[PDB]
Every structure is written in C-alpha cells, then in structure tokens.
Amino acid sequence: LYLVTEEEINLTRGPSGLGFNIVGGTDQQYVSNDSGIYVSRIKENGAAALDGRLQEGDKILSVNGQDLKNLLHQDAVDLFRNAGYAVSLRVQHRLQVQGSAYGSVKAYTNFDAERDALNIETAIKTKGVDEVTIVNILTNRSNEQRQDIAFAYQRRTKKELASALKSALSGHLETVILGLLKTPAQYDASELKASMKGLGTDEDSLIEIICSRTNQELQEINRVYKEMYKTDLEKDIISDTSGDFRKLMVALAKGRRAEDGSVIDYELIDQDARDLYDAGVKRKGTDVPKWISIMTERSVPHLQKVFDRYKSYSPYDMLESIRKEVKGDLENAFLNLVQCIQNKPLYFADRLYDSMKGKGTRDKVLIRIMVSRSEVDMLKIRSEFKRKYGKSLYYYIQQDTKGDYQKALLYLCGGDD
Template sequence: MVRSLWNVSWVCVRVRLNKVPANLLVSFTNHLMKMALVSEFLTKLTLSYGGEREPKCPTVVPAFDFNPEEDAAKIETAIKTKGVDEQTIIDILTKRCCSQRSEIVFEYEKRAKKDLVSALKGALSGSLEHLIVGLMKSTAQYDASEIKSSMKGLGTDEESLNEVLCSRNKEELMEIKKVYREMFKKELEKDISGDTSGDVAKLLLALVQAKREEPSSVVDYEKIDNDARALYDAGVKRKGTDVTTWITIFSERSVPHLQKVFERYKRYSPYDIKESIKKEVKGDLEKSFLTLVECLENKHLYFASRLNDSMKSKSVKEKVVTRIIVSRCEVDLMKIRSEFKRNFGKSLHQTISEHTKGDYQKALLNLCGGDD
C-alpha cells in the first residue's frame, strides 16, 4: 500500500514539478508517506479485528514468589496430620495456576515417593475431594473427565454433556478431543455416538467436529440474511423441522455471525429463535438447541444462570457449581462473576457464602477470587 500511494503521489508531482518550490515538494511528499503508513497500519488492525482469541479473564492467576518444594512439603505435612489439615491444602492448591500445581505434583512425588492425586483422594472426601482432584487436571483434562463421567453407567447426563460441548470454542473442543483420546484410549465421537442417538447425537457430533468458522472483520449481510431465512424456512415456515439445516448453521457459523443471524431472524419469523426452537422440537433435542443458543448469545450469562439455578434452593447442585467454577477459574470466571452480579442482584461470592459451607465453601470462595 505504501508503494502504491508513493507511485500515485510521484505521478501527480511530476505533472507540475517545475512550478512547485522544493521545500513544499519535500513537505508534501513526507505528508503523503505518513498518511500511507497510517493507512497501512489501520488496514492491518481492521483485518485482525474479530479473528483473534477471546482474551482470558481468570480469577486464578500464577502465585507470586512461587516455591513448589515448599508447597509440596506443606501439603505432605497437611495430609499426614491426624485428621488432615484441609485448610493448608485448600490455601495452596486453590491459589496456584495449573502449571504451578503440576510443579507441586512433581516435587511432592519426588519427596513422598507416592502419587499426589491418590494421596489427596485418600485424605479428602465428598465435594471438597471432587473439587481439589479436579484442580489437579488441566482445563481440557477436566472437561474430558466430566464428559466421560456424564456418559458413564446407565443413562446419559445430557445436561452436563450439553453444558460442556455447547459452551466450548473451536480451539477448546479440539484440545478436549486430543486429551480425551490420551486419557481414555477412545475417540470422543465414538463414545458420543454410542451413548446418544437421533438428532441429539447429530448435533453433539457436529459440535465436536469443530467446524465453526473463525470470526471475520467483514460483515457479510447477504449471508446473514440467507442463514436467517434458511432457519425460518427449515422450521416455523414448514410442516415438520429440517433439523439438518439447523444443525449445520448452528454448528458451523462463527459466533458473531450467528448473533446477527438471530437478530435478522425476527424479520422473518413471528417468534424469536428460542421460541421457535420450543415450538419445533421437544425433549432432549430442545434442551440441546436452547443450551447452544444461550451460549452463542452470551456464554458468560449462560454460566452465571447455571450457577444461580444451582444455588437457588436449599439443596445446592454441588456437582454443577464445582464443574463451572473449576473449569472456568483460569479462563473467564471474572466475566461470569460480572454477569452474575448484573443479572441476579447479588455477587457470586455472596451467593456461594450463603448456600455452601465448610471447607468446600472456602475452596469455592478462593477460586471465585473475591467479591464484587
């Protein structure tokens, strides 16, 4: 771009070269060059916009002055203590990032000659055990474990399966598939096919294939309109639902594109996209589509709503609370906290304090990272 603008400016200058003072000519040329550089910079900025990774907003960050040998020694003592010193275990492991916890594992096993995760399982119990053991995995390993757990035994925990598969981005899904293969010596797609069926299986498998397009700096209004109309034609407009078309659009288009499609959809349909889903499909497929749309519209609000629903009654759904807090504390829990406070009037920290107790509560609050 700099070269092309320079060529244009030189042609223009040559037309009346003899009539322009030298100092003005130099000044004018320098000005054109600066404009060209600025233009080139802005062009690059525009082209990269929307295509970059979503910035992380974690609540758990690397600890300052980290000493893995010292942490490992303290944890060994805490486990050996009569009655177990849960507070020390919580204070260390919930305030270290994943890579630091890995170093602690290495140092512990070097000094104690035993596996730290096994030692923690023997020392802890209940919800606290599940939370702390979950922290000893990477985010992808934890997600893979939760997916495997949701398909274990009689019946499938579709709610948990939907939560993980519908909310993870393309990069996260590809990493989960890789880690799942390493951990369980099976392909994730094969296990989903064996544990789900029909259109639900088709939707989940389409998500796991991770074909979602990357966001673009160019807004394709024609494609937005075509997709909105296709969703309407495949559902509300006709008798019966062309689920395949819905699955293709929902699983392959970029998130910003789909957000615009959902807005455009209202031009064609008397119902918004969620109302259309409720009218067109039922049961597990309805739940899967609704979860996916909620994540596409506002993933952080989806997680905040899940947390709020899990702590509404006296019987807290600790499994759901643990999974969201553990899986998102090093990703975007800060954004989830903001959505929680904005939509439900109380902070996540306050809600956890009111609905949980004991060591489990202490661990959750540490991972939550403060009050809002």
C-alpha cells in the same frame, strides 16, 4: 480477540521437501465453508522448521505469486508439487494474545513448587489433615502451577498428590480439589467420559461441555480423550446418544466451527436468518439438519448477528422458537448452544444460579463451572451474575455451601461482586 499479520516467507526445498503439510480447498474445508489452504503439520529438521517463520495453522495466501483462493485441494497441491526449489509464500498468521485476563485465578507471583509440595505433604500428614492449608494453596495457584506442585510432590514422596488427597479429603471438597489438579483438557475429558452410561447417559453434562467449548479447547479435549481412554470421543458420543441429538453432539464435538473472518458477511447473515425461520417457525414440523448445520458451521460472531436478524423475520426470537419447535434432549442442547453463542458468561451465570436457586445444590454443575471457568471468564460470569441477580455469585455460593468446601469455591470465585 485475535491478531492477523501477513508475511512473505521464502524457502528452499531441500532433499526432504519444504517440510509441512497443507489442508484445505473448496472440497476439503479446514473448517466449515472455509476454502482456505492452511498449514497442518510442520516437520522437525525440515525446511520450514529450520527457517522458523511459518507456523502451524497459518493460512497460505499465495505460492510464487499464485493465489490459493477458492482452489480445489488438488490444484493447490499441484502448485506446490510443480514449484521450483525456491518457493516464495505469502502467509497469514492468526494469533491469540489473551490467556486468562478474565479469569479469577491468576498465577501466583512468588510461586515455589517445591515449597508448596512440602507444605501440602505436611498439611496431609498432620493429625486430622490441614484442609485449610491445602485449600489456601491449591485454589490460589494457576492450573499449570498445580501441575508443578503435583510433579514435585511425587518426586518427594514417591506417591501421586491426587492419590494422597483422595485419602486425606472427602465429600464435595475432594471433588473440587481433584478437579483443580487436572489440566483443563483432562478435566473436561474425564467429565465427558464420566457422563456416558449407555442408556443412562448424563446428557445435561454432555450438553454443557460440548456446547460451550471452542474449537481449540475441543481439539485438545479430543486429543487428550483418546490418550486417557484409548477411544475417540466422537465414537463414545455415537454409542451413547441417538437421533438428532447425536448428530448435533457429534457435529459440535468435532470442533471445526468456522473462525470469525475479518469481513462481516451481511448477505449470509440475512440468508441464514431466513433459513432458520423457513426451517422452523414458518413451516409445519422442523428441518432439524438445517438448524444443526447453520448453528454448528458458522462462527460465533456471525451467529450472534444471525439471531438478531432472525427477529426481523420471526415473531419469536431464537430461544423461544426452539421451545416451540423441538423437545427433550434436542431442545435442551439447542437452548444451551444458543445461549453459549449469544452470551457465554451469562450462560454460565444462569447455570450457576440454577444449581443453587432451589432446594439443596446441584454440586456437580456448580463445581464443574467454578473449576473449569476459573481461568477463562469467571470475572465476566460474576459481572453478568451480579447484573442479573442483584447479588453476587460469591453471595449465592456462601448461602448454599458451608465449611472448607465453601471456602474453596469462594476462592475460585475470587471475590465479591
């Protein structure tokens, strides 16, 4: 699901240098076990910026014809420091051209932010509150459009839309609507922050978010978490967890999993599979650091093939191996992480079924998944839910929730089956 294009970029070193920072090398790896040299920052008014072709996150293949393959960080630095003022770079761009193709909530084509804000104010001030209008609008606009609605609402009423909705709404409907009004990174960061209660930490919610978010999402959550709460997320994980569960949660929350390379490393797939077996089912006890490193460092496609090759060696697959090897929060985090790796849409489909199958509703889990995945992979979640449970996700939301709260959730579902 990416696009790679190689390009030669020729720059002139001006009075303030080439104008970008490089990360990487065999001893300062950009992501896990990746020795490539990458562009981290690009300085305004610099040579690279004024040129425009080089982008943040580019991989630098060579400098003046000299390859930056398997170099120490200093040797890569030295090639730049000792190049002339005319520097020729071969660069590899990595692209993401997907967006919300599998989300259920699409951008409204006839969007009018000022009009939406007016209609929402009117629905708010109406005697008794017009919840239906509020739900109809916000659950049928994309997250970014909701931001523009919120901005215009403040501009018109000189009051924040979220504050007005805290007073006009209640119950589970308020929880959904307030969740939709946050950006994805803000929603996840606030859900993570709300889970940390010292010894009473909501580990299930930590596991859900940290095990299912990608590198890009996690790096944005990390950035937004520090802005909102003036403390790094990793520090909050450290002071709210312990033991191997903390190490796993810290490692995943760094968001530095290896990106899927073009070549498939079949030798490393087999070796990782053997290591997971040797560290667990094959021995007395468990080498947990070995599981943590492998399951957090390797790319998701690579690990998908590792777990299948694992069944060639182990009488038990990875999931039932975990249930036989570890307990408690550690076992639950491993089970969630492996499901996310093997089939993330199915992972959320099973969680949604879990939140509704029994008595009552785990509304916190149901709402968080319906909100956070509505613009990511909700169509895939619905497909996996339908295939496994025979009836639709729409149907289960219908039987388990009522009123305008049900209406908003069904809108985020997007349709039947």
